Amino acid sequence: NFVNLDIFSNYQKYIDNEQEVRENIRIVVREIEHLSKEAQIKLQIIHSDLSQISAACGLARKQVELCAQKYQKLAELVPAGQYYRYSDHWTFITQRLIFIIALVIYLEAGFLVTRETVAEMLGLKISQSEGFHLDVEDYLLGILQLASELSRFATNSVTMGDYERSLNISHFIGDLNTGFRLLNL
Amino acid sequence: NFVNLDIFSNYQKYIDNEQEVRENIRIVVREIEHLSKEAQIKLQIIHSDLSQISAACGLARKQVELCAQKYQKLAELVPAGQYYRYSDHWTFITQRLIFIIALVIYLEAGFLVTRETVAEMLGLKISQSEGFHLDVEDYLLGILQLASELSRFATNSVTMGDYERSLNISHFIGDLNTGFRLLNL
Amino acid sequence: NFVNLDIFSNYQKYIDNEQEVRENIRIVVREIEHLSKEAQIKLQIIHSDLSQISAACGLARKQVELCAQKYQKLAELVPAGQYYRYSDHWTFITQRLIFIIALVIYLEAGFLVTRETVAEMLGLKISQSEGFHLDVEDYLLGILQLASELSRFATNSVTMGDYERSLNISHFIGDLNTGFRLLNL
Amino acid sequence: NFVNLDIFSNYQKYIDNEQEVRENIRIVVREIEHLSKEAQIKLQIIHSDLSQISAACGLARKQVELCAQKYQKLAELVPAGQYYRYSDHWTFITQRLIFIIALVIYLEAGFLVTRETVAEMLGLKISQSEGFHLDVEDYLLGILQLASELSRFATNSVTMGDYERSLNISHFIGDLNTGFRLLNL
């Protein structure tokens, strides 16, 4: 009737290390939260004060690459082919970034970003294989945010009386809406 | 060292009955789902085909009172002062109804309903005390839906080219948005 | 196309007050957590040190009535017939108390408590109607805890070598197990 | 103001395929549920009828390898180094199997299995790298189940009066309990 307390002790070695791996991830992603959060807090203004767009974009765009670096400590910190093991840690972060970027470009140049750009722009691989990549589901979900965010924008747009800009946003949203209908539930 | 299996058997009497009380609720609310669900499915059309509004409203408005009746079996089915004990069963239902009604009136007459109306309209008490009532949080949440639904409408509105109706919805949403800012997170 | 911002302002009056009602509940229940938590932390000892039972029971039993008082500020703080509206706040608390009490008595006198006792013991009404009551589902769930806790106890019992006490706990658990089989899933 | 509906159409190609990959997994794991579920349903008997253990073990042990095969369609069905991408599908299944196996051996030979065995026994790699592996967290969690299941067994044991077997289970549980204390919260 025996339990061998080596099977257990020998797992406290693995766990000890896993706690730590999972810790340095938690730590880097902690800054990337922090940075991104402030680009996001700034891009806030477009709802109350149209003039300010330009600068808010400028700032966002600064952060965005101030933290394409962080995605690089993080990058080397993830072992082997084990992205998906941890990917839970940088998914909400990576989504908010896609979203942010996507918003910027739309404000800036009035059209939808490509994954391949957001990729370059964060300094991330376009696919699985060549290294630490940007996951397609994330992209798609960042874009989802965008659409929701623009709806809020079109409505604020009207209350500040930029009636026609509102109408543009709405052409555009309805465009995503059909791009999305082209997919699923 | 004794457990008295009467304390237990005597609770199988209460449980037996509670299962049943909770069952006849579940059953009525099952239809009210069913009915409401179809008003909701019909009012769907306003996004693809503006002409149809009028009829969709007519139908909704039929259902709405086809099931102000159901809220009456349900009404007498709930004992004592125990609304809140079960209220979990008719909360998502009651919310969708507020929402529906609210949408109708806005389409119909272009303004925000009063709780006191939705109340009369479902045949429900305006407050706690005079009997089976319409809960304020529910109302507020039905209205929340509305706002979200109208945003979708303003955007579809533009793709069908009713540019100015779109702009109206947006004045209105922004109106709720300030009514809501007047409250909390 | 009008929203009347009185319908809204007039609800900030109700909400203001509800926040507050819900706040003084949150506050009392905050102590009852605190107290109970310490009886619970003490009754911990029975797993490592059998001698200590007696004192741990003594202490628990002190707390228990040090906070049959709190259930009395709380008591008068809840309006009308609106127990169930808030009952979500004191359910995990009230469960841990039933559990605690139940454990005490079993340790003390080796048998299962009656709801009617836990009731008197916390100074709570035996039913719905005569006032602030002890809810049957809670009781039953406190007892559930008990059974789970005793299983842990029987196993610790054996490692400290009180072989026969272990066997008693097991007669008793198996007794609840049939009391419970007498009910449902 | 343009959305390019190729970026979208080109993703309906990837999604189409992902739905399908994720589908053939869902399908195999559907049987492994089915099989395992029945070994589990049989090993049930040890609580009511001690004689039967031997046969229940025999049966379990049959299933176990009737579905070390399934873990082989599944095996080749998972691409590249993407275990963790899908691993969500076979985690509750793989846990119940570890648990089952672990129970069998304990019943059979009265001691705790090694991961390396459960591995061989399901025909799974001992680590990450040499191929489709058995994840350490899963193992540990299957064992957790075991302990919980044995507690139930020790208590049933006593009601059928095998007093001393009960005491053995309890030495053993308390053994795991210290193996586990040797780890974390």
XYZ file of C-alpha atoms in Angstrom:
740
model
C 0.000 0.000 0.000
C 2.665 2.561 -0.963
C 2.872 6.034 -2.420
C 6.358 6.901 -3.577
C 7.025 10.525 -2.668
C 9.603 10.890 -5.433
C 7.067 10.828 -8.179
C 5.773 13.892 -6.281
C 9.078 15.622 -5.409
C 10.262 15.230 -8.913
C 7.181 17.112 -10.092
C 7.815 19.969 -7.675
C 10.916 20.502 -9.854
C 8.885 20.933 -13.063
C 6.168 22.981 -11.346
C 8.795 25.238 -9.761
C 10.111 26.081 -13.195
C 6.695 26.344 -14.872
C 5.603 28.891 -12.237
C 8.654 30.873 -13.252
C 8.279 30.601 -17.029
C 4.646 31.596 -16.592
C 5.928 34.466 -14.404
C 8.282 36.275 -16.769
C 5.527 36.079 -19.370
C 3.054 37.536 -16.925
C 5.629 40.309 -16.226
C 6.361 41.447 -19.853
C 2.703 41.286 -20.871
C 2.224 43.458 -17.796
C 3.973 46.333 -19.420
C 2.424 45.764 -22.828
C -0.893 46.132 -21.054
C 0.320 49.336 -19.451
C 1.620 50.926 -22.681
C -1.265 49.928 -24.954
C -3.698 51.014 -22.232
C -2.524 54.553 -22.540
C -2.667 54.758 -26.353
C -6.175 53.550 -25.844
C -7.000 55.999 -23.181
C -5.805 58.814 -25.445
C -7.568 57.776 -28.667
C -10.517 58.296 -26.403
C -10.733 61.994 -27.293
C -11.989 61.478 -30.853
C -15.448 61.279 -29.284
C -15.429 64.676 -27.624
C -12.957 66.680 -29.756
C -12.359 66.092 -33.437
C -9.357 68.496 -33.779
C -7.325 66.253 -31.509
C -7.502 63.115 -33.685
C -4.197 63.904 -35.357
C -2.259 64.056 -32.141
C -4.034 61.074 -30.597
C -3.038 59.099 -33.688
C 0.510 60.366 -33.379
C 0.679 59.116 -29.788
C -0.931 55.738 -30.376
C 1.483 55.238 -33.221
C 4.358 55.965 -30.795
C 3.208 53.402 -28.208
C 2.509 50.872 -30.853
C 6.210 50.625 -31.590
C 7.329 51.335 -28.120
C 5.774 47.930 -27.553
C 6.651 46.042 -30.675
C 9.796 45.821 -28.671
C 8.121 44.191 -25.732
C 6.708 41.599 -28.086
C 10.378 40.736 -28.426
C 11.395 40.003 -24.934
C 8.158 38.032 -24.876
C 9.196 36.609 -28.221
C 12.364 34.931 -27.063
C 10.802 34.064 -23.697
C 8.449 31.492 -25.253
C 10.051 28.066 -25.872
C 10.058 25.483 -28.642
C 6.742 25.290 -30.463
C 4.715 26.245 -27.363
C 2.984 29.471 -28.354
C -0.431 27.965 -27.756
C 0.458 26.709 -24.344
C 0.694 30.309 -23.078
C -0.973 32.326 -25.809
C -3.752 32.887 -23.229
C -1.660 35.586 -21.643
C -1.203 37.794 -24.686
C -4.534 37.408 -26.380
C -6.554 40.230 -24.934
C -3.478 42.426 -25.177
C -2.738 41.473 -28.757
C -6.399 42.000 -29.586
C -6.492 45.551 -28.168
C -3.357 46.345 -30.226
C -4.838 45.128 -33.520
C -7.894 47.136 -32.637
C -5.830 50.235 -31.821
C -3.723 50.061 -34.943
C -6.824 49.370 -37.043
C -8.525 52.512 -35.612
C -5.455 54.705 -36.228
C -5.177 53.701 -39.890
C -8.898 54.217 -40.451
C -8.755 57.661 -38.835
C -5.489 58.417 -40.647
C -6.206 57.046 -44.137
C -9.827 55.903 -44.050
C -9.582 52.124 -44.831
C -9.094 48.643 -43.276
C -5.598 47.477 -42.305
C -4.069 44.235 -43.411
C -3.029 41.588 -40.991
C 0.378 41.597 -42.799
C 0.807 45.234 -41.823
C -0.255 44.903 -38.129
C 2.227 42.050 -38.224
C 5.144 44.165 -39.516
C 4.021 46.934 -37.341
C 4.306 44.942 -34.103
C 7.271 43.043 -35.554
C 5.479 39.699 -35.601
C 5.510 36.778 -37.994
C 2.758 36.483 -40.555
C 2.411 32.780 -39.878
C 2.888 30.117 -37.286
C 6.136 28.752 -38.721
C 8.662 31.589 -39.286
C 8.402 32.418 -35.576
C 6.373 34.274 -32.949
C 3.263 35.041 -34.967
C 0.098 37.087 -34.967
C -2.813 34.801 -34.659
C -5.552 35.163 -37.336
C -8.402 34.810 -34.794
C -6.950 37.641 -32.821
C -6.709 39.896 -35.871
C -10.340 39.165 -36.788
C -11.377 39.944 -33.251
C -9.460 43.219 -33.077
C -11.381 44.219 -36.217
C -14.568 43.232 -34.497
C -13.754 45.670 -31.753
C -13.083 48.324 -34.319
C -16.524 47.997 -35.813
C -18.081 48.290 -32.446
C -15.961 51.288 -31.623
C -16.784 53.075 -34.837
C -20.481 52.708 -34.154
C -19.953 54.664 -30.961
C -17.909 57.162 -33.022
C -20.528 57.684 -35.695
C -23.011 58.528 -32.962
C -20.720 60.909 -31.189
C -19.802 62.303 -34.544
C -23.411 63.482 -35.056
C -23.735 65.128 -31.658
C -20.669 67.213 -32.411
C -22.408 67.869 -35.757
C -19.906 66.394 -38.272
C -22.932 64.875 -40.073
C -21.074 63.713 -43.125
C -18.137 62.034 -41.393
C -20.798 60.119 -39.541
C -22.147 58.915 -42.844
C -18.733 57.731 -43.925
C -18.161 55.707 -40.813
C -21.521 54.082 -41.572
C -20.639 53.142 -45.129
C -17.509 51.599 -43.688
C -19.146 49.721 -40.841
C -21.699 48.265 -43.238
C -18.705 47.232 -45.309
C -17.194 45.202 -42.459
C -20.660 43.927 -41.757
C -20.746 42.358 -45.131
C -17.133 41.166 -44.861
C -18.196 39.441 -41.687
C -21.503 38.030 -43.006
C -19.130 36.402 -45.559
C -17.902 34.292 -42.588
C -19.923 32.733 -39.698
C -21.763 32.668 -36.255
C -23.804 8.715 16.540
C -27.208 9.146 14.863
C -28.680 10.789 11.804
C -32.442 11.038 11.975
C -33.823 10.302 8.518
C -36.984 12.294 9.204
C -35.250 15.603 9.083
C -34.415 14.397 5.545
C -37.759 12.823 4.535
C -39.589 15.832 5.729
C -37.498 17.954 3.374
C -38.285 15.714 0.414
C -41.840 17.017 0.972
C -40.820 20.679 0.567
C -38.426 19.940 -2.304
C -41.110 17.909 -4.090
C -43.379 20.923 -4.060
C -40.658 23.472 -4.865
C -39.699 21.460 -7.971
C -43.320 21.785 -8.994
C -43.792 25.486 -8.243
C -40.564 26.130 -10.126
C -42.013 23.936 -12.910
C -45.258 25.730 -13.725
C -43.250 28.948 -13.792
C -40.752 27.393 -16.151
C -43.736 26.272 -18.307
C -45.585 29.653 -18.670
C -42.368 31.599 -19.226
C -41.775 28.966 -21.895
C -44.566 30.304 -23.989
C -43.775 33.940 -23.289
C -40.356 33.161 -24.699
C -41.970 31.576 -27.731
C -44.376 34.463 -28.453
C -41.953 37.332 -27.832
C -39.329 35.470 -29.868
C -41.448 35.758 -32.937
C -42.274 39.471 -32.584
C -38.554 39.820 -32.334
C -37.811 37.700 -35.287
C -40.219 39.795 -37.357
C -39.059 43.270 -36.286
C -35.908 41.936 -37.831
C -36.910 43.169 -41.293
C -36.444 46.876 -40.550
C -32.789 46.283 -41.420
C -33.325 44.982 -44.929
C -36.677 46.536 -45.939
C -37.950 49.855 -44.669
C -41.480 49.586 -46.211
C -42.236 46.667 -43.925
C -41.744 48.530 -40.623
C -45.438 49.315 -40.339
C -46.526 45.722 -40.519
C -43.701 44.459 -38.315
C -44.833 46.985 -35.711
C -48.413 45.845 -36.133
C -47.384 42.246 -35.444
C -45.112 42.950 -32.495
C -47.906 44.986 -31.007
C -50.210 41.950 -31.395
C -47.835 39.554 -29.605
C -47.129 42.059 -26.938
C -50.693 41.751 -25.711
C -51.106 38.183 -26.659
C -48.605 37.761 -23.847
C -49.657 40.356 -21.350
C -52.058 37.570 -20.699
C -49.360 35.059 -19.983
C -47.902 37.471 -17.471
C -51.177 36.737 -15.721
C -51.102 33.050 -15.311
C -47.537 33.692 -14.197
C -48.916 36.499 -12.073
C -51.149 34.391 -9.889
C -48.659 31.506 -9.944
C -46.140 33.407 -7.796
C -46.863 33.274 -4.035
C -46.832 35.704 -1.131
C -44.116 38.325 -1.452
C -41.745 35.979 -3.325
C -41.230 37.676 -6.678
C -37.496 37.888 -6.135
C -37.179 34.267 -5.242
C -38.067 33.301 -8.834
C -37.700 36.545 -10.746
C -34.644 34.865 -12.338
C -36.947 33.016 -14.674
C -38.688 36.005 -16.217
C -35.876 38.491 -16.378
C -34.406 37.892 -19.785
C -37.925 37.490 -21.125
C -39.209 40.642 -19.487
C -36.129 42.467 -20.734
C -36.660 41.440 -24.379
C -40.288 42.641 -24.082
C -39.359 46.093 -22.761
C -36.836 46.241 -25.548
C -39.403 45.174 -28.156
C -42.063 47.588 -27.011
C -39.480 50.375 -26.761
C -38.397 49.732 -30.398
C -41.999 49.689 -31.680
C -42.856 53.040 -30.089
C -39.654 54.623 -31.381
C -40.330 53.334 -34.898
C -44.011 54.260 -34.571
C -43.802 57.682 -32.892
C -40.094 58.472 -32.667
C -39.492 58.826 -28.863
C -38.644 56.901 -25.647
C -41.365 54.929 -23.848
C -42.183 55.298 -20.205
C -41.869 52.467 -17.791
C -45.480 53.286 -16.715
C -46.627 52.551 -20.252
C -44.671 49.263 -20.752
C -46.243 48.440 -17.412
C -49.842 49.080 -18.551
C -49.022 47.535 -21.807
C -47.984 44.180 -20.325
C -50.586 44.610 -17.578
C -48.026 44.846 -14.788
C -47.838 46.879 -11.611
C -45.797 50.050 -11.588
C -44.317 49.172 -8.222
C -43.432 46.326 -5.951
C -46.438 46.711 -3.652
C -49.693 46.821 -5.688
C -48.793 43.404 -7.114
C -46.774 41.590 -9.777
C -44.556 44.428 -10.942
C -42.150 45.457 -13.655
C -38.745 45.745 -12.200
C -36.920 49.080 -12.786
C -33.562 47.376 -13.513
C -35.211 45.339 -16.186
C -36.765 48.396 -17.825
C -33.395 50.188 -17.844
C -31.798 47.141 -19.380
C -34.427 46.744 -22.093
C -33.646 50.359 -23.027
C -29.998 49.480 -23.099
C -30.762 46.840 -25.666
C -32.710 49.352 -27.659
C -29.764 51.682 -27.933
C -27.590 48.896 -29.099
C -30.180 47.797 -31.598
C -30.654 51.256 -33.015
C -26.942 51.563 -33.644
C -27.203 48.527 -35.885
C -30.271 50.173 -37.481
C -28.600 53.486 -38.193
C -25.861 51.605 -40.011
C -28.219 49.495 -42.023
C -30.246 52.588 -42.628
C -27.315 54.151 -44.537
C -26.649 51.122 -46.714
C -30.250 51.202 -47.871
C -29.596 54.936 -48.400
C -32.133 56.548 -46.007
C -29.326 58.957 -44.991
C -31.472 61.284 -42.968
C -33.352 58.688 -40.926
C -29.915 57.460 -40.004
C -29.114 60.886 -38.662
C -32.240 60.904 -36.551
C -31.493 57.588 -34.950
C -28.099 59.078 -34.072
C -29.514 62.172 -32.416
C -31.679 59.814 -30.415
C -28.971 57.360 -29.438
C -26.765 60.219 -28.278
C -29.774 61.311 -26.260
C -29.964 57.994 -24.392
C -26.218 58.142 -24.098
C -26.516 61.265 -22.095
C -29.506 59.932 -20.136
C -27.297 57.022 -19.221
C -24.143 59.053 -18.449
C -26.526 60.724 -15.933
C -26.401 57.361 -14.073
C -23.411 54.995 -13.500
C -20.859 52.181 -14.402
C -37.590 62.750 -31.791
C -37.274 63.387 -28.038
C -35.783 61.738 -24.992
C -37.067 63.233 -21.774
C -34.163 63.442 -19.340
C -36.489 63.348 -16.339
C -37.369 59.743 -16.791
C -33.584 59.352 -16.357
C -32.941 61.860 -13.534
C -35.787 60.468 -11.586
C -34.135 57.052 -11.745
C -30.832 58.422 -10.476
C -32.854 59.047 -7.287
C -33.841 55.374 -6.904
C -30.406 54.098 -7.949
C -28.718 56.472 -5.494
C -30.690 54.925 -2.675
C -30.381 51.328 -3.905
C -26.576 51.693 -4.000
C -26.834 52.709 -0.372
C -29.234 50.001 0.807
C -27.025 47.478 -0.962
C -24.073 49.152 0.812
C -25.052 48.819 4.465
C -25.863 45.187 3.728
C -22.479 44.708 2.135
C -20.956 46.334 5.272
C -22.640 44.174 8.008
C -22.142 40.944 6.069
C -18.538 42.125 5.918
C -18.098 41.600 9.592
C -20.082 38.377 9.693
C -17.599 37.114 7.138
C -14.748 38.272 9.339
C -16.059 36.670 12.558
C -17.192 33.355 11.071
C -13.914 33.177 9.141
C -11.994 32.958 12.344
C -14.157 30.278 13.999
C -13.508 28.418 10.813
C -9.846 29.014 10.807
C -9.655 27.686 14.367
C -11.784 24.546 13.947
C -9.015 23.833 11.514
C -6.870 22.205 14.209
C -9.010 19.077 14.591
C -7.007 17.713 11.659
C -3.579 18.015 13.225
C -4.315 17.874 16.982
C -7.211 15.996 18.512
C -6.738 17.322 22.108
C -7.614 20.806 20.919
C -11.124 19.986 19.644
C -12.721 21.031 22.915
C -11.282 24.503 22.860
C -11.840 24.982 19.132
C -15.488 24.109 19.740
C -15.604 26.527 22.644
C -14.327 29.329 20.406
C -16.539 28.604 17.417
C -19.471 28.548 19.777
C -18.432 32.022 21.014
C -18.259 33.536 17.513
C -21.451 31.891 16.516
C -23.338 34.084 18.951
C -21.069 37.011 18.652
C -22.605 37.098 15.192
C -26.171 36.100 15.797
C -26.157 39.712 16.750
C -24.927 40.865 13.395
C -27.740 38.921 11.792
C -29.808 41.503 13.633
C -28.514 44.717 12.303
C -28.776 42.932 8.970
C -32.206 41.789 10.077
C -33.755 45.204 10.434
C -31.758 46.538 7.474
C -33.744 44.452 4.969
C -37.100 45.996 3.948
C -40.646 44.781 3.405
C -40.783 41.268 1.994
C -37.501 41.660 0.068
C -35.239 39.003 1.556
C -34.778 37.339 -1.806
C -33.860 40.534 -3.528
C -30.606 40.681 -1.526
C -30.298 37.204 -0.068
C -27.362 36.812 -2.501
C -25.179 38.702 -0.085
C -25.650 36.478 2.944
C -25.840 33.086 1.343
C -22.260 31.938 1.358
C -21.898 33.432 4.819
C -25.037 31.810 6.153
C -23.933 28.538 4.589
C -20.508 28.564 6.290
C -22.281 29.230 9.622
C -24.678 26.286 9.286
C -21.670 24.225 8.357
C -19.671 25.489 11.346
C -22.439 24.952 13.848
C -23.174 21.526 12.357
C -19.485 20.518 12.788
C -19.353 21.761 16.401
C -22.423 19.769 17.449
C -21.141 16.635 15.728
C -17.749 16.985 17.420
C -19.442 17.917 20.705
C -22.328 15.421 20.823
C -21.855 13.185 17.789
C -25.101 13.745 15.762
C -26.772 15.955 13.099
C -28.186 19.356 14.078
C -31.687 20.482 13.337
C -32.420 23.458 11.205
C -34.688 24.671 14.078
C -31.652 24.753 16.345
C -29.243 26.531 13.912
C -32.166 28.909 13.593
C -32.456 29.614 17.345
C -28.767 29.600 17.572
C -28.275 32.426 15.061
C -31.524 34.019 16.246
C -33.315 33.517 12.939
C -36.876 32.650 12.028
C -37.735 29.070 11.211
C -39.823 30.159 8.253
C -40.270 32.854 5.689
C -43.227 34.531 7.396
C -42.423 35.268 11.079
C -39.454 37.348 9.905
C -35.826 37.208 8.774
C -35.473 33.482 8.211
C -32.948 30.748 7.612
C -33.390 29.435 4.166
C -33.859 25.631 3.841
C -31.570 25.382 0.774
C -28.836 27.044 2.718
C -29.205 24.651 5.649
C -29.057 21.643 3.305
C -25.966 23.069 1.691
C -24.189 23.760 4.976
C -24.769 20.075 5.774
C -23.323 19.193 2.425
C -20.174 21.008 3.389
C -20.107 19.147 6.646
C -20.094 15.794 4.932
C -17.277 16.854 2.745
C -15.362 18.186 5.698
C -15.803 15.043 7.729
C -14.386 12.963 4.912
C -11.204 14.989 5.191
C -11.401 14.472 8.981
C -11.795 10.717 8.834
C -8.663 10.568 6.708
C -6.658 12.800 8.957
C -8.055 10.891 11.863
C -6.311 7.711 10.630
C -2.933 9.342 10.090
C -2.962 10.518 13.686
C -3.975 6.908 14.456
C -7.424 7.365 16.085
C -8.587 4.388 13.965
C -11.928 3.958 15.628
C -13.045 7.591 15.600
C -12.355 7.391 11.904
C -14.792 4.532 11.662
C -17.459 6.517 13.443
C -17.164 9.472 11.142
C -17.644 6.975 8.307
C -20.809 5.465 9.728
C -22.074 9.009 10.031
C -21.090 10.186 6.573
C -22.738 7.134 5.039
C -25.767 8.130 7.077
C -25.957 11.578 5.464
C -25.250 9.891 2.179
C -28.419 7.966 2.506
C -30.324 10.993 3.835
C -29.223 12.757 0.696
C -29.916 9.875 -1.729
C -33.455 10.253 -0.267
C -33.530 13.599 -2.160
C -32.163 14.457 -5.661
C -29.456 15.452 -8.292
C -13.105 54.766 -47.694
C -12.680 51.137 -48.806
C -12.907 47.670 -47.337
C -11.347 45.058 -49.570
C -13.538 41.961 -49.454
C -10.629 39.699 -50.376
C -8.946 40.056 -47.057
C -12.272 38.589 -45.851
C -12.876 35.926 -48.537
C -9.384 34.700 -48.176
C -10.046 34.113 -44.482
C -13.197 32.127 -45.207
C -10.721 29.665 -46.776
C -8.721 29.244 -43.545
C -11.833 29.212 -41.346
C -13.465 26.611 -43.600
C -10.540 24.301 -43.015
C -10.154 25.086 -39.303
C -13.827 24.187 -38.736
C -12.999 20.863 -40.328
C -9.751 20.142 -38.480
C -11.555 21.027 -35.265
C -14.339 18.677 -36.443
C -12.470 15.407 -36.915
C -10.912 16.017 -33.511
C -14.320 16.594 -32.004
C -15.435 13.317 -33.684
C -12.634 10.956 -32.431
C -12.691 12.402 -28.917
C -16.409 11.682 -29.172
C -15.808 7.993 -29.128
C -13.065 8.149 -26.521
C -15.650 9.823 -24.330
C -18.100 7.047 -25.102
C -15.683 4.172 -24.369
C -14.088 5.615 -21.230
C -17.558 6.570 -19.986
C -18.532 2.963 -19.811
C -15.400 1.724 -18.007
C -16.261 4.443 -15.581
C -19.842 3.517 -15.283
C -18.819 -0.064 -14.510
C -16.088 0.638 -11.938
C -19.058 2.166 -10.225
C -19.984 -1.137 -8.568
C -17.055 -1.200 -6.133
C -19.254 0.956 -3.900
C -22.164 -1.442 -3.617
C -20.548 -4.860 -4.232
C -16.978 -5.713 -3.351
C -16.923 -9.174 -5.063
C -17.323 -7.496 -8.430
C -14.128 -5.401 -8.281
C -12.142 -8.019 -10.164
C -14.432 -8.051 -13.144
C -14.923 -4.284 -13.164
C -11.139 -3.962 -13.286
C -10.992 -6.507 -16.078
C -13.467 -4.460 -18.119
C -11.916 -1.061 -17.490
C -8.604 -2.542 -18.494
C -10.214 -3.707 -21.769
C -11.612 -0.262 -22.645
C -8.427 1.408 -21.670
C -6.677 -0.230 -24.595
C -9.652 -0.298 -26.818
C -9.062 3.441 -26.736
C -5.322 3.732 -26.717
C -6.079 3.128 -30.325
C -8.333 6.116 -30.624
C -5.564 8.240 -29.181
C -3.891 7.254 -32.431
C -6.277 8.461 -35.003
C -6.343 11.574 -32.842
C -2.572 11.335 -32.728
C -1.958 11.705 -36.427
C -4.883 14.124 -36.779
C -3.063 16.879 -34.865
C -0.587 18.895 -36.985
C 2.921 20.262 -36.577
C 3.659 21.347 -33.024
C 0.033 22.347 -32.326
C -1.012 20.081 -29.469
C -1.793 23.038 -27.248
C -3.917 24.721 -29.831
C -6.520 21.939 -29.507
C -5.527 20.156 -26.322
C -8.740 21.667 -24.877
C -10.713 18.927 -26.543
C -8.957 15.954 -24.986
C -8.248 17.246 -21.531
C -11.279 16.171 -19.583
C -11.197 12.883 -21.462
C -7.514 12.306 -20.854
C -8.037 13.226 -17.214
C -10.838 10.676 -16.687
C -8.571 8.014 -18.258
C -5.623 8.724 -15.950
C -8.097 8.628 -13.118
C -9.595 5.333 -14.314
C -6.273 3.630 -14.839
C -5.020 4.960 -11.498
C -8.091 3.469 -9.722
C -7.691 0.075 -11.438
C -4.042 -0.279 -10.415
C -4.805 0.756 -6.841
C -7.664 -1.749 -6.632
C -5.555 -4.364 -8.431
C -2.163 -3.918 -6.739
C -2.722 -1.329 -4.017
C -0.324 1.536 -5.013
C 0.012 4.731 -7.121
C 0.650 4.468 -10.869
C 3.441 6.216 -12.665
C 2.820 8.718 -15.367
C 5.292 6.676 -17.509
C 2.974 3.692 -17.216
C -0.330 5.534 -17.977
C 1.685 6.832 -20.903
C 2.656 3.372 -22.223
C -0.731 2.162 -21.369
C -2.545 4.683 -23.578
C 0.341 4.558 -26.059
C 1.364 8.168 -25.495
C 4.706 9.923 -25.368
C 6.275 10.627 -22.012
C 7.231 14.120 -23.098
C 6.317 16.934 -25.396
C 9.032 16.237 -27.968
C 8.956 12.552 -29.050
C 5.347 13.061 -30.160
C 1.729 13.158 -28.993
C 2.268 13.280 -25.248
C 0.503 12.939 -21.935
C 0.451 16.250 -20.252
C 1.833 16.357 -16.664
C -0.964 18.662 -15.412
C -3.501 16.207 -16.656
C -1.820 13.287 -14.898
C -1.705 15.234 -11.618
C -5.357 16.076 -12.005
C -6.423 12.508 -12.750
C -4.702 11.577 -9.475
C -6.609 14.326 -7.773
C -9.808 12.712 -8.915
C -8.598 9.408 -7.613
C -8.116 10.758 -4.131
C -11.550 12.191 -4.144
C -12.995 8.960 -5.421
C -11.257 6.857 -2.822
C -12.690 8.997 -0.059
C -16.138 8.051 -1.290
C -14.917 4.423 -1.422
C -13.575 4.344 2.109
C -16.963 5.530 3.320
C -18.902 3.027 1.311
C -16.395 0.449 2.365
C -17.462 0.887 6.018
C -21.181 0.639 5.337
C -20.617 -2.701 3.651
C -18.519 -3.482 6.756
C -15.036 -4.077 5.249
C -13.653 -1.989 8.154
C -10.024 -2.725 7.519
C -9.964 -2.082 3.774
C -11.431 1.260 4.696
C -8.445 1.898 6.899
C -6.066 1.079 4.089
C -7.681 3.464 1.676
C -7.234 6.096 4.393
C -3.537 5.452 4.873
C -3.235 5.808 1.127
C -5.291 8.963 0.761
C -3.296 10.613 3.533
C -0.253 9.558 1.547
C -1.384 11.456 -1.558
C -2.370 14.271 0.731
C 1.184 14.641 1.776
C 2.464 14.141 -1.783
C 0.218 17.010 -2.733
C 1.064 19.272 0.239
C 4.613 18.853 -1.186
C 3.336 20.979 -4.124
C 0.999 24.046 -4.086
C -2.420 25.929 -3.996
